[PDB]
Write a protein that binds this ligand. Sequence first.
Ligand SMILES: Cc1cc2nc3c(=O)[nH]c(=O)nc-3n(C[C@H](O)[C@H](O)[C@H](O)COP(=O)(O)OP(=O)(O)OC[C@H]3O[C@@H](n4cnc5c(N)ncnc54)[C@H](O)[C@@H]3O)c2cc1C
Ligand SMILES: Cc1cc2nc3c(=O)[nH]c(=O)nc-3n(C[C@H](O)[C@H](O)[C@H](O)COP(=O)(O)OP(=O)(O)OC[C@H]3O[C@@H](n4cnc5c(N)ncnc54)[C@H](O)[C@@H]3O)c2cc1C
Ligand SMILES: COc1ccc(OC)c2c(C)cc(=O)[nH]c12
Ligand SMILES: COc1ccc(OC)c2c(C)cc(=O)[nH]c12
Ligand SMILES: [Zn+2]
Ligand SMILES: [Zn+2]
Lengths: 230, 230
Amino acid sequence: AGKKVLIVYAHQEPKSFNGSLKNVAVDELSRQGCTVTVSDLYAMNFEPRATDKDITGTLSNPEVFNYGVETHEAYKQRSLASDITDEQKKVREADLVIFQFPLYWFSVPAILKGWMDRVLCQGFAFDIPGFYDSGLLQGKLALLSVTTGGTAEMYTKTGVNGDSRYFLWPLQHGTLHFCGFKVLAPQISFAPEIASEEERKGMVAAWSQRLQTIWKEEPIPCTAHWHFGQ
Amino acid sequence: AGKKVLIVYAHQEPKSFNGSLKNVAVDELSRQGCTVTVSDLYAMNFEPRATDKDITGTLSNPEVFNYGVETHEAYKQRSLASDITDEQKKVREADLVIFQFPLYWFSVPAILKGWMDRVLCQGFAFDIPGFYDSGLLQGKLALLSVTTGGTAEMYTKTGVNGDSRYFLWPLQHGTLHFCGFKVLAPQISFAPEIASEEERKGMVAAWSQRLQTIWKEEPIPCTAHWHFGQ
Ligand SMILES: Cc1cc2nc3c(=O)[nH]c(=O)nc-3n(C[C@H](O)[C@H](O)[C@H](O)COP(=O)(O)OP(=O)(O)OC[C@H]3O[C@@H](n4cnc5c(N)ncnc54)[C@H](O)[C@@H]3O)c2cc1C
Ligand SMILES: Cc1cc2nc3c(=O)[nH]c(=O)nc-3n(C[C@H](O)[C@H](O)[C@H](O)COP(=O)(O)OP(=O)(O)OC[C@H]3O[C@@H](n4cnc5c(N)ncnc54)[C@H](O)[C@@H]3O)c2cc1C
Ligand SMILES: COc1ccc(OC)c2c(C)cc(=O)[nH]c12
Ligand SMILES: COc1ccc(OC)c2c(C)cc(=O)[nH]c12
Ligand SMILES: [Zn+2]
Ligand SMILES: [Zn+2]
């Protein structure tokens, strides 16, 4: 229907399994009539470091630099660097944000971690108070579409890696729920380098097939119980 | 003495509270007679992105870029960029690696996330297969020293943030354990911005005093049960 989608994509290689999942997302959401934007972070050379270069004006305190204080104040004053504000505009307009990435060290690749660190600033994505259920991005949906080297069996409670949900907690709860997103159940595509040609093809189509009905899903309960059990 | 320590430090401001923790660590460990080296990532302008610039000479496939594959071969062929191999040399020589950083989004700042992604490469830190215990940095100790914005009550099992140990999982287990480290208990310094100028001292001293007997310490048991169970 009339919905805007931002895909934040973090993979160096267009011909990759990630590039395929990103392209089927664009193809399918386009086909439905959605408005679609992609931030391809590596192709943008997106800057991941949180530095004093992200504020253009007089610093609230130039003697002792505090990145969170200075960016909050820069956001209010409109003196944040324009690569940050460009991304904030995409996220403000979007109804659903999809993050497409390969799992690196049980988390996102650094370039994507830098997008989170720099774009989700105080005043824009949350305030104090104004976080978790009162976060500023309330009304928006987010979804992580994650690829892994490890197999599904490896990511079970009694597997070596532990359950897949355990690694989702900092991203789903600590970032996305904190900012007020409702979180849709993650898409995890396990061990596509191991899988056969039929199996990889089935994983791509399972994602295209899920996206056909994405606007009918309910969000997960983004609680400790969902992630950890017990 | 005779022990080597690497401190990988990620804060933009020398006068920061992280800055004071790093400086107390260098002072106390140097006083004990340890060999101490610090990687000040922001001062080094350390590159956080995983790209094809991490490999010198020609690529073992310049048509489909695969970071894991390309770096693995580059490592074995002594063809990694010198920023990465400088860090690996420090790590190989170290008996204890201390990471000193503010918590950003229940994780490390992206510049430190980038150190993990680019320095801890296959062949160096682990192999495929090659990990957890067949895991190449076995024998070394690692320690996370984290500062937070949110007070310790927020980080209780029924605080809004959940248990501290929930966010340590990807770093302690999925990164440090995976590579073979024994993980010392994390030094978590809750909420220094909310002062007082006084109790900001009790935290710096407990860290100083804890470093006095650091080599006597018992590693945590780095299991799903420690981070999650009862
Ligand atoms: C620094 C680093 C840290 C990592 N940490 C972890 C970790 O903590 N946990 C973990 O489990 N893994 C980890 N990995 C492994 C990583 O998560 C996997 O390598 C990545 O998820 C696989 O995705 P890809 O897109 O690169 O696969 P690719 O290598 O591109 O794809 C696999 C195959 O799919 C094929 N393909 C592409 N498009 C299609 C299509 N349309 N249809 C059928 N096939 C297609 C490709 O040609 C290729 O042969 C890490 C890797 C690195 C480099
Ligand atoms: C992008 C981003 C994401 C964040 N995500 C989270 C998160 O997920 N969870 C969370 O809990 N928090 C989070 N925070 C907040 C962050 O973790 C804290 O702001 C940070 O940990 C505070 O440490 P600092 O060194 O920067 O404190 P500082 O502000 O530098 O220091 C506190 C005070 O101590 C003073 N000081 C310096 N040296 C000494 C000394 N010797 N003795 C006494 N005082 C001294 C300083 O002058 C300062 O006034 C986030 C922050 C940002 C910017
Ligand atoms: C790197 O390639 C990988 C393939 C499979 C994995 O499976 C569990 C991992 C993990 C767990 C950590 C890691 O760094 N890399 C992995
Ligand atoms: C100074 O800012 C903060 C203080 C306390 C926080 O958590 C208890 C956070 C979190 C979770 C995210 C963030 O971005 N900033 C925080
Ligand atoms: Zn949640
Ligand atoms: Zn472990």
